[PDB]
Design a protein around this ligand. Structure first.
Ligand SMILES: CCCCCCCCCCCCCCCCCC(=O)OC[C@H](CO[C@@H]1O[C@H](CO[C@H]2O[C@H](CO)[C@H](O)[C@H](O)[C@H]2O)[C@H](O)[C@H](O)[C@H]1O)OC(=O)CCCCCCCCCCCCCCCCC
Ligand code: CLA
Ligand code: CLA
Ligand code: CLA
Ligand code: CLA
Ligand code: CLA
Ligand code: CLA
Ligand code: CLA
Ligand code: KC2
Ligand code: KC2
Lengths: 51, 100, 178, 226, 61, 172, 172
């Protein structure tokens, strides 16, 4: 590598199964609070004060 | 002077709040729909502004090139590169040395 | 005013030695002697003469569109500046000129109407129209501008078929001493 | 002046600058008010059901809806017929004479190569599901529902599966079918035009624009470990 | 003739840059004098057009 | 009058609203415009198809030394007829148009008293000579009016139509 | 309508009794089934005789260098048409069959409303318009339907009908 001009730089499939599973596995924790809950617009100055 | 006049207009003689008699141009700053519509208008005009260069290089008089073959010259860009791995491979490149 | 009694202006004013607006003297009751036709038919010849004279100056000045007029081998410069300029054109070109003239003529700009069209002289489709007092003048100005071009373009027709082009007529002897 | 229905003009939710000529009316499920030129003001009756039936009605669409349904349904099967020969296996041909007529991935040229006995048997089946529709137009008469090959969940149409879907979800499905019908027709026109603009299929275009083409791609990794 | 037309064009625009916002920031004198500034605004653009023809003709003469 | 023209599968088809007046008088004139563009575009497509088949006359067209084979197929043909030939079209067609034999007076139920010989006339079949055959000629025109807008645009982007058919037929 | 197709020698001829029952409908069905088989068979033997007599069109049928002369007479012909030709047959003949021009509903007492000009004559000849001409067209079909069963089963043995008239005409 070292100026191989890579995309999000990366030279193996092994780091593709590091980018996606470490985003996703700290994403699925975020989903476990915010799944199955939608809508409820509020029209205020940054309330978004739902729980 | 056209843009200067209308700016002096709506700062001196204009509706101070647009949402009284102009609901199309009025907003709340909290209307998430209406603020995205003003985005989505302005994104189209930046979009049409970018093809306006693509019209300039391909069709209307061409665009100057230093890598132009046999000398720097105004030339028409007949075949640009629309491969997204080439194109978005600039954005996902590193910002450090020689990547750039 | 709409079109009546316009264009009668000093030092002359009104003109009938002949009898053709006197409605009983000459060429009368034969055919199409409606004065509002002849009223109009003056204006259109004036309008075509105004574009003919002004357009001829821009032709003779060497102001030319850059490029080729066809792809059978005539550039815009190869059209002469003079009278044979409508000759040296592709005939299928001259088809197309007359056609779009005819499209204006059948539908768009008046050519059924005995008055003038809607254009209302300013710039664009906005059409800044004249209201009361100035309009009686400037519609009759268009008539007098029309007639001066009608005398001007035919003057010119007599010139260079009997003489040389306006570029050599302004590069050689022209009437006065100067 | 029978098409004077541009006198009263219902809002075109499609075109907020233009108007809809009041025959759209919000009856039919697909209506969101798109009629920029016309054909809404006039309907046409089924000419294939009658010389008597050649003439039509004044407000009943039923037939522009079908032509929207049939073209849209064929297009949904069609977009897979362009795309799926590239993603999957391409059917080894050794039954009759002629080897590898199937293997072509361009769907316009693979049409001509594959033997005339094969697309005939498609045309015979695609026939047979449609004389069926002739009889269903005759039998149902003026009770006619614009879809209806007798496939659905009620009536004992045919009903294989657990098609238990409630009448509210039934209204969703007819809307979801129709929205994909309108979307797939533009898709087949896209796929038919890309197969002319390049002589390759979709997987040889989209799978070509994801490659780092060979004259731009770097050489490799020749650094030693010592 | 171009130099004289742009000389008039600057001197009109001096009056425009001065007298227009003095009449805009006046709550009374806009609605009354608007037909005095309409005559000069229409004259001003109609002088831009008559000066663009002048360069247009007298370059490619 | 009315009760003619379009038909299955359209019937009265004015979908943009250009004639919805309820007035016959504007509809009268636009009908006879359509008859005339009917009649002209029909003889121009069959003129186009017979010119494109290589069906020409023998000999020179004049003492310019232009044969009938010299005059190219397509749009150029009428354009590069010699001018004195184009006057003689005008002199003859213009007489044939405005006053003699065809008189188009004012758009008037141009009936022109050329009613076939036995065929297709009154005191015979009711359905046929009008309300059908009077309807087909118009729809024949409706095909051929669209045939030239094609044909011109086919010639506008490519060469002539026989040179459109040896090379590419697919779109731009 | 009922009394049609039953002129001498055979009269009404239902030998096996399949119109032994009643209804107009299955007699309606089998009539226009019979007429369309009639109309198709008649142009197919006239299509046969004009092919087999050597009447062709010069020029290629496609880019292939397949001329019309290279397409042989008989049953190799329709099969060795290029496929994109046959799919343009099924487009046009299709649109002409169901839809354009030739309405096909259930056999509607197929009138099609065209025929000629002074010819259809009810109000002139009530036994010439139908019951003779409408009877012969049925039978000319009844000949030609028996012509193509003939046309195949002859050509199933090697010489066809131009080839079958240079060698042997006798049976197997
Ligand atoms: C912490 C990490 C911060 C990440 C951003 C810093 C990296 C910026 C960098 O090293 O920038 C360098 C690159 C410029 O790239 C250079 O790009 C050059 C590109 O030139 C090549 O390409 C050219 C193409 O014509 C010519 O051909 C040229 O000759 C040829 O060499 C070479 O590749 C160089 O090697 C390469 O360094 O900038 C970029 O990518 C653009 C980056 C945007 C600037 C980011 C902000 C910079 C940080 C400012 C911080 C301000 C303080 C904020 C905090 C408070
Ligand atoms: C960012 C650019 C911008 C925007 C959003 C507006 C928006 C507006 N202008 Mg405006 N204007 C501008 C630039 C702009 N202007 C400039 C550059 C000038 C100088 C030429 C003017 C001169 C101007 C005048 C003189 C007037 C407006 C008026 C208006 C209002 C109604 C116009 C309308 O509905 O048109 C409809 C068109 C399409 C939907 C609207 C709030 C009018 C107004 O507020 O009325 C009191 C009015 O009288 N404008
Ligand atoms: C009676 C009016 C008239 C006639 C017969 C012509 C005829 C002609 N002009 Mg001309 N022209 C006219 C008015 C006229 N013009 C006017 C009003 C102007 C000023 C805008 C010009 C400016 C002009 C230029 C700058 C050029 C021509 C050229 C030509 C020649 C080629 C055809 C062409 O490109 O049209 C050009 C027509 C227009 C650009 C539109 C004219 C505006 C209409 C009449 C209003 C042809 C002989 C070309 C040539 O080769 O001349 C030597 C050329 O380059 N004309
Ligand atoms: C210097 C000559 C000259 C002058 C003074 C005018 C003046 C005028 N023209 Mg004009 N015109 C000119 C040259 C001129 N034209 C040329 C060269 C042509 C040919 C292109 C025309 C073609 C023309 C048309 C087609 C029309 C005018 C019209 C008008 C009048 C506007 C009145 C109005 O608002 O009616 C509305 C109330 C105005 C008086 C309008 C007119 O006569 O309407 C009364 C109009 O529509 N002009
Ligand atoms: C009277 C007739 C006339 C003529 C002959 C021209 C001629 C010209 N104009 Mg012009 N113009 C005219 C009327 C005219 N204009 C009018 C009525 C307007 C509107 C008010 C304009 C607005 C206009 C703009 C906005 C521009 C031109 C430009 C140009 C030049 C472009 C050609 C070029 O690149 O060559 C080479 C030309 C030159 C070296 C000199 C210019 C050319 C000399 C363009 C220009 O200046 O490009 C450099 C330009 O940007 N014109
Ligand atoms: C030569 C032009 C022309 C004219 C004047 C008419 C005139 C008429 N047609 Mg008609 N028609 C034409 C060509 C024409 N037709 C063509 C080429 C077709 C084939 C598509 C048809 C198909 C057609 C049908 C199917 C029906 C009519 C009908 C009618 C009548 C009602 C008005 C109407 O439909 O809009 C008249 C339209 C115009 C005058 C258009 C103005 C010109 C436009 C704006 C130009 C646009 C160009 C376009 C983009 C090119 C594509 C009227 C007598 C109706 C009728 O007979 O009722 C019993 C009817 O039902 N027309
Ligand atoms: C609007 C229709 C139209 C137009 C513009 C033309 C125009 C032309 N035809 Mg044409 N033609 C037409 C209809 C038309 N024809 C029809 C309907 C037929 C069939 C009867 C023909 C049969 C025909 C032949 C056989 C030939 C032409 C030829 C020509 C060209 C020379 C003039 C001539 O001899 O005309 C002849 C016109 C007629 C015979 C019919 C009109 C009377 C000229 C461009 C000649 C040529 O050089 O081809 C380019 C030529 O040899 N035409
Ligand atoms: C059952 C109807 C039928 C069928 C299936 C065919 C089939 C065929 N004909 Mg054919 N033909 C027919 C009736 C038919 N014909 C009739 C009635 C005529 C007399 C008008 C002809 C006159 C004819 C000629 C002159 C030629 C063919 C040729 C051909 C072959 C090439 C396809 C083609 O160009 O067709 C063309 C079809 C027609 C010209 C007429 C279609 C007739 C109906 C009414 C429509 C093809 C196998 C060509 C060939 O290969 O020769 C062996 C050829 O040169 N046909
Ligand atoms: C509207 C159809 C039509 C009619 C009714 C008609 C009647 C007559 C009569 C009257 C009885 C005579 C005596 C006559 C004679 C000539 N015609 Mg003919 N003519 C018709 C049409 C055309 C076209 C379309 C052309 C043409 C020509 C010639 C030339 C040779 C000229 C030359 O070689 O200089 C001569 C002598 C060609 C041409 O003008 O070439 C410059 C040419 O394009 N004609 N023509
Ligand atoms: C039912 C009678 C019939 C009608 C009404 C009709 C109408 C049209 C129309 C416009 C309305 C167009 C534009 C058109 C165009 C072409 N037709 Mg045609 N066509 C007819 C039928 C057949 C048959 C049997 C064949 C055929 C062909 C071609 C080829 C060349 C393709 C090529 O060689 O590349 C092209 C371009 C041959 C073919 O498909 O060759 C593979 C071939 O066998 N067509 N055809």
């Amino acid at each position: 590598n070292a100026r191989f001009a890579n995309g999000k730089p990366q030279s193996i499939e092994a780091k593709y199964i590091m980018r996606s599973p470490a985003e996703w596995d700290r994403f699925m924790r975020f989903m476990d609070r915010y799944a199955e809950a939608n809508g409820l617009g509020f029209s205020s100055x940054x309330x978004x004060x739902x729980x | 002077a056209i843009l200067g006049f209308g700016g002096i207009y709506h700062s001196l003689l204009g509706p101070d709040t647009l949402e009284e008699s102009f609901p199309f141009f009025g907003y709340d700053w909290r209307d998430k729909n209406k603020m995205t519509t003003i985005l989505g208008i302005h994104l189209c005009l930046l979009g049409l502004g970018s093809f306006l260069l693509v019209i300039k290089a391909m069709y209307l008089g061409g665009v100057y090139d230093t890598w132009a073959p046999g000398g720097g010259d105004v030339r028409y860009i007949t075949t640009p590169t629309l491969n997204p791995i080439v194109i978005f491979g600039y954005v996902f490149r590193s910002p450090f040395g020689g990547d750039g | 005013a709409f079109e009546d009694e316009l264009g009668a202006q000093p030092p002359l004013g009104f003109f009938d030695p002949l009898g053709l607006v006197x409605x009983x003297x000459x060429x009368x009751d034969g055919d199409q002697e409606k004065f509002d036709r002849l009223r109009y038919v003056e204006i259109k010849h004036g309008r075509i003469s105004m574009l003919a004279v002004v357009g001829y100056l821009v032709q003779e000045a060497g102001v030319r569109l850059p490029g080729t007029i066809d792809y059978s081998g005539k550039t815009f410069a190869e059209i002469p500046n003079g009278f044979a300029a409508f000759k040296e054109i592709p005939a299928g070109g001259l088809v197309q000129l007359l056609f779009f003239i005819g499209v204006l003529e059948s539908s768009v700009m008046r050519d059924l109407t005995x008055x003038x069209x809607x254009x209302x002289x300013x710039x664009x489709x906005x059409x800044x129209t004249f209201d009361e007092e100035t309009q009686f003048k400037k519609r009759a100005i268009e008539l007098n501008q029309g007639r001066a071009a009608q005398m001007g373009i035919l003057a010119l027709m007599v010139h260079e078929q009997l003489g040389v082009s306006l570029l050599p007529x302004x590069x050689x002897x022209x009437x006065x001493x100067x | 002046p029978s098409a004077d229905a541009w006198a009263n003009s219902v809002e075109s939710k499609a075109l907020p600058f233009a108007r809809a000529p009041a025959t759209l009316d919000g009856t039919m499920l697909g209506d969101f008010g798109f009629d920029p030129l016309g054909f809404s003001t006039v309907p046409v009756g089924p000419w294939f059901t009658g010389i008597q039936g050649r003439n039509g009605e004044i407000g009943n669409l039923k037939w522009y809806r079908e032509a929207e349904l049939i073209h849209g349904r064929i297009a949904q099967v069609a977009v897979v017929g362009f795309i799926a020969p590239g993603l999957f296996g391409t059917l080894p041909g050794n039954e009759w004479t002629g080897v590898d007529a199937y293997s072509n991935l361009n769907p316009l040229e693979a049409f001509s190569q594959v033997p005339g006995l094969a697309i005939l048997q498609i045309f015979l089946f695609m026939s047979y599901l449609e004389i069926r529709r002739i009889n269903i137009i005759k039998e149902e008469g003026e009770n006619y529902m614009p879809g209806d090959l007798r496939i659905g969940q009620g009536e004992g149409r045919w009903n294989p599966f657990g098609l238990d879907y409630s009448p509210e979800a039934y209204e969703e499905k007819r809307l979801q079918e129709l929205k994909h019908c309108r979307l797939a027709m533009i898709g087949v026109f896209g796929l038919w035009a890309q197969a002319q603009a390049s002589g390759v299929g979709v997987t040889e275009q989209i799978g070509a624009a994801l490659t780092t083409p060979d004259y731009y791609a770097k050489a490799g990794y020749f650094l030693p470990e010592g | 003739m171009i130099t004289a037309l742009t000389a008039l064009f600057v001197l009109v625009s001096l009056a425009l840059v001065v007298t227009v916002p003095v009449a805009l920031a006046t709550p009374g004198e806009w609605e009354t004098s608007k037909d005095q500034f309409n005559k000069i605004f229409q004259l001003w653009v109609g002088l831009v057009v008559a000066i663009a023809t002048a360069d247009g003709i007298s370059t490619a003469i | 009058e009315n009760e003619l023209g379009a038909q299955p599968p359209l019937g009265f088809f004015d979908p943009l609203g250009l004639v919805e007046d309820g007035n016959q008088a504007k509809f009268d004139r636009l009908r006879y415009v359509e008859l005339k563009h009917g009649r002209i575009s029909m003889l121009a497509v069959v003129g186009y198809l017979i010119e494109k088949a290589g069906i020409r006359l023998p000999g020179n067209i004049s003492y310019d030394g232009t044969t009938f084979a010299d005059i190219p197929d397509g749009f150029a043909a009428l354009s590069k007829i010699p001018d004195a030939g184009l006057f003689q079209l005008f002199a003859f067609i213009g007489f044939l148009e405005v006053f003699v034999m065809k008189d188009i007076t004012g758009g008037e139920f141009v009936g022109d008293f050329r009613n076939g010989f036995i065929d297709f006339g009154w005191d015979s079949f009711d359905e046929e000579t009008k309300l059908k055959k009077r309807a087909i000629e118009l729809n024949q025109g409706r095909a051929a009016m669209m045939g030239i807008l094609a044909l011109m645009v086919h010639e506008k982007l490519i060469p002539l139509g026989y040179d459109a058919d040896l090379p590419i037929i697919g779109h731009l």
